[PDB]
């Protein structure tokens, strides 16, 4: 038993059927967007129908929104002639052809690698337009080539999500150390931090082991441990967006010429960060308010394209200050059946 997702035009008979709503990638290869279209024989000369896969990228900041400019670009646009008035098919496409009928025209897209995943920036209450981020869309045009204008009635628009999952290899656990020499003679202060693991799932607790060796003439006042999320925007040379999604301040003090080891638990979640405008979250379809953006994996030997999301645990000690950063990956694992891509309890 298998089921597909169908999108129908407001007018006429133009129905697009897609097997799955998520098209994941394995760095080396990307799952192809395979689907079918049913179009009624309502045309006389316009016997050409096109399918366009567009990886649109939009961005807007608070200062830019106030000024009145919002960046927009098309990272990758692929056009395929669905109707052949070569191109191997799949078992799902063959089953769709058999069930739908002879009019079922297939279309297959092979998404090239080194493309950003579907990540949408969280919009504030003021923003009411298109979602800011990278969105993958499939648009069906029943018109004579691309010369004619795009018609809302004829075109079928369906939002698809390209996401990555946690790698099979967990990777070495982060372990970051920093020794600082104070201006008062040669008095070294040592800080070290370690994580339970390198790959982290959304909602899972994060355990950080922090050890401080004070050989100075000052006492540490407070320790701030935060989970910074960084959103590198390669296009338009936009400045890096850094946002603390979780924080913990400890008033404990460490005496000079003494050692102190402790463990801290930080669990990032969206409820506390719901008011952070511009935060990068997972791909959205109809404003479902998905989880935090899964940290993209740059396994390629590394291209400046789209939005690159990363997470780092930052530990800061005051009395200047000593700051250390431990990168970690906050990515969803491979789901058993499929990602629902929506709030499972609708109400």
């Amino acid at each position: 038993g298998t089921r597909v997702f169908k999108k129908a035009s407001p007018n006429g008979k133009l129905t697009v059927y897609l097997g799955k709503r998520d098209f994941v990638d394995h760095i080396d290869l990307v799952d192809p967007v395979d689907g079918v279209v049913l179009v009624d024989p309502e045309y006389l000369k316009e016997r050409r129908v096109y399918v366009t896969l567009t990886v649109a990228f939009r961005y807007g900041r608070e200062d830019l929104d106030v000024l009145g400019l919002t960046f927009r670009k098309d990272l990758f646009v692929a056009n395929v002639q669905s109707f052949p008035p070569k191109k191997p098919l799949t078992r799902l496409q063959e089953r769709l052809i058999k069930k739908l009928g002879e009019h079922a025209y297939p279309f297959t897209f092979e998404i090239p690698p080194n493309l950003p995943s579907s990540v949408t920036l969280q919009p504030g209450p003021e923003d009411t337009g298109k979602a800011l981020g990278v969105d993958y869309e499939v648009k069906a045009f029943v018109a004579e080539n691309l010369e004619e204008k795009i018609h809302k009635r004829n075109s079928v628009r369906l939002v698809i999500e390209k996401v990555q999952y946690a790698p099979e290899r967990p990777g070495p656990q982060p372990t970051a150390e920093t020794t600082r020499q104070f201006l008062m003679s040669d008095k070294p202060l040592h800080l070290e931090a370690s994580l339970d693991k390198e790959i982290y799932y959304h909602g899972e607790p994060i355990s950080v082991n922090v050890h401080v060796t004070n050989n100075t003439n000052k006492t540490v006042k407070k320790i701030k441990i935060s989970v910074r999320q960084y959103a590198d925007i390669v296009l338009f040379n936009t400045a890096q967006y850094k946002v603390p999604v979780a924080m913990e301040e400890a008033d404990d003090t460490v005496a000079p010429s003494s050692t102190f080891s402790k463990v801290y638990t930080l669990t990032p979640f969206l409820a506390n960060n719901r008011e952070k405008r511009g935060l990068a979250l997972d791909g959205k379809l109809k404003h479902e308010d998905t989880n935090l953006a899964s940290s993209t994996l740059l396994r390629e030997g590394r291209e400046i394209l789209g939005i690159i999301v990363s997470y780092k645990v930052k530990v800061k000690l005051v009395v200047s200050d000593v700051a250390v950063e431990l990168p970690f990956t906050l990515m969803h694992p491979k789901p058993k059946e499929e990602p629902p891509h929506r709030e499972v309890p609708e109400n």
Epitope: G1, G203, F269, D289, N291, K336, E337, P339, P340, V344
Partner: single-chain antibody, 222 residues
Framework: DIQMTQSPSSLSASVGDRVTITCRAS??????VAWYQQKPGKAPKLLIY???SLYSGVPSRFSGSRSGTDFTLTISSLQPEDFATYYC?????????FGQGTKVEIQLVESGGGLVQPGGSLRLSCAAS????????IHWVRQAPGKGLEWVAS????????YYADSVKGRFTISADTSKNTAYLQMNSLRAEDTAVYYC?????????????WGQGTLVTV
């Protein structure tokens, strides 16, 4: 709300036979229908989740199918230990009330039970082990004698969402102590309207792979 109809009301078959149970929904549910089972004196256990996808930890004899709105649960062989009460649940929409419940015939810890005054406040404590409140959604479901399970409360700490049934709205408060990694349920009510045993179950936080783990529960008598 969406009401689920479960048939047959009572079923009896020989050991090793094939038993088919039908579940009809009020409207379309987008195949977000699960099948649970419970034994007398025992907490319910999930059997089938997410449109006939078998859950880990249960025998492969159980199978599911979906024909439009109708859902079918098929048991190829009726094992001697496979004599339990089956329920059909839909979690596509809130409320997530279960089905009528069919009968077949030939970690989480809950506390806070005991004698209850006719009108007053009750507190139920749910100790959770092996998982975090931000990595799962905590639900509280009551079961009254002579009737099946009924969804009552749901809390999702990751999204900060809370949901209550219409019959319990305005009087039920559910909280998740992340530091203590536990759940608290406060119910200020009157009479014996909520004289039922309460189970503290959990579901996957994001994809909601059914109510896999169910609490033992404690008896509440008004």
């Amino acid at each position: 709300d969406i009401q689920m109809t479960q048939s047959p009301s009572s079923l009896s078959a020989s050991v090793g036979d094939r038993v088919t149970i039908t579940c009809r929904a009020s409207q379309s549910v987008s195949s977000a229908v699960a099948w649970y089972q419970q034994k007398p004196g025992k907490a319910p256990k999930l059997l089938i989740y997410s449109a006939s996808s078998l859950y880990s930890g249960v025998p492969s004899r159980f199978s599911g199918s979906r024909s439009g709105t109708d859902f079918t649960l098929t048991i190829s062989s009726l094992q001697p230990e496979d004599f339990a009460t089956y329920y059909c649940q839909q979690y596509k929409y809130v409320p997530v009330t279960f089905g009528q419940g069919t009968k077949v015939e030939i970690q989480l810890v809950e506390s806070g039970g005991g004698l209850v005054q006719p009108g007053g406040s009750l507190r139920l404590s749910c100790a959770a082990s092996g998982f975090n409140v931000y990595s799962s959604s905590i639900h509280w479901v009551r079961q009254a004698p002579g009737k099946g399970l009924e969804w009552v409360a749901s809390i999702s700490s990751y999204y900060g969402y809370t949901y209550y049934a219409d019959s319990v709205k305005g009087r039920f408060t559910i909280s998740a102590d992340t530091s203590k990694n536990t759940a608290y349920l406060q119910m200020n009510s009157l009479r014996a309207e909520d004289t039922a045993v309460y189970y503290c179950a959990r579901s996957r936080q994001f994809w909601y792979s059914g109510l896999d783990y169910w609490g033992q529960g404690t008896l509440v008598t008004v």
